[PDB]
Ligand binder design. Structure first.
Ligand code: 78P
Ligand code: 78P
Ligand code: 78P
Lengths: 147, 147, 147
């Protein structure tokens, strides 16, 4: 059925997204360390790496919404509505993380540490919120895949 | 011992950024056409391309600020400060365009056309604002390179 | 083919190599954290990422040796000779780090903590040796571009 072709594609997207999230976590931790140590040039490199991975998470989150919107169109009922709603909230949170990371990158480039720290700390908190939604989405999809 | 290399890197970054801006414009035009013609799958492809190019413009704009900030440290004069201020305003505008494109991409994925159209038109306007600052920056750098 | 173009290539290679070394350091830190926290799948991913960056460092080291030998032919200079000797010692050291990282990868795959711990500790010690050599190389290249 198209429904399980879509669920299959969704599992592949989310597996790829998880790998990217692990890379984003590494880059985020490295940026925090460079920031603590006053290594400004190293921090710039780690922030650019984080922004690259965050852009990739954003793309995967968009693809996840598009796939669940497609799944809902093949369903005659609201079985996939909950998963789509989670995925849409995930995407909203991921894009907020992206915007706030951008504010941090610009503040670091502008040499405005107070703005940098505020935005970077928001980015970290949004990432934790996104992680909660990501795991919720995985659980919801497992219940749609049956076997 | 450094400013000439900084200036040459800046010229290379801005040349690469302009090509990316042209590619972004082509993707934007193609997305507008797909939207008007109701071809949602085509629109998704063109929006993903636009988002990729926009992320690259964002990166080049960050690099531009960092290079001009370095130049201002080496040669702390009014020319350098003016160039950096223009580049910082360019980066601000580029990142506003990036966040607005994110809203549009999410709306298209969510099937929310009212939000998509409003955000997409805001994105176009911010792009034109960024173009003005980009050309202003080029004129200032001409005065800084002195041939 | 001219002395100045070869130096320009060397400067670019070492710039790129330092960014790759930063990525290797972030992946290594993330692997250490996953190892300490007992997250074996995360550890496996970060070891694979570290090995990828280590292999890229190895290739930049190869290219640096080749380029310095080319520079000695067209612009003899006791300092290019010094740089080549450092770069060759660096190449040997980064290859040894790659070997020990490979041993760590295999030990994680086999679930052999005793072998893993020894190999990972050796990898760290060799990375610090390579870091010292890389700093010496950067200093020598700075002198080659003219003190
Ligand atoms: C906790 C952490 C994080 N987990 C995420 C899960 C899904 C999305 C994002 C995101 N930023 O878009 C996440 N960010 C580790 C990487 C930085 N923060
Ligand atoms: C007019 C146009 C545009 N010109 C820009 C110049 C600098 C930056 C951006 C940006 N979006 O960051 C620009 N966007 C063409 C490409 C789509 N909109
Ligand atoms: C400090 C660290 C390290 N610094 C290096 C500098 C040049 C080469 C290498 C290498 N392994 O080839 C380096 N490794 C980061 C990861 C653990 N060791």
């Amino acid at each position: 059925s198209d429904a399980q072709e879509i669920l299959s594609r969704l599992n592949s997207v989310l597996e790829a997204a998880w790998k990217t999230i692990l890379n984003l976590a590494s880059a985020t931790d490295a940026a925090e360390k460079a920031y603590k140590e006053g290594r400004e040039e190293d921090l710039a490199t780690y922030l650019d790496q984080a922004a690259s991975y965050q852009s990739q998470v954003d793309q995967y989150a968009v693809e996840t919404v598009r796939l669940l919107a497609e799944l809902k169109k093949v369903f005659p009922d609201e079985e996939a509505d909950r998963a789509l709603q989670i995925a849409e909230k995930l995407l909203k949170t991921v894009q907020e993380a992206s915007k706030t990371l951008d504010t941090a990158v610009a503040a670091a480039a502008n040499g405005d540490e107070e703005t940098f720290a505020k935005a970077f700390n928001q980015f970290v908190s949004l990432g934790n919120q996104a992680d909660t939604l990501f795991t919720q989405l995985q659980r919801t999809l497992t219940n749609l895949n049956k076997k």
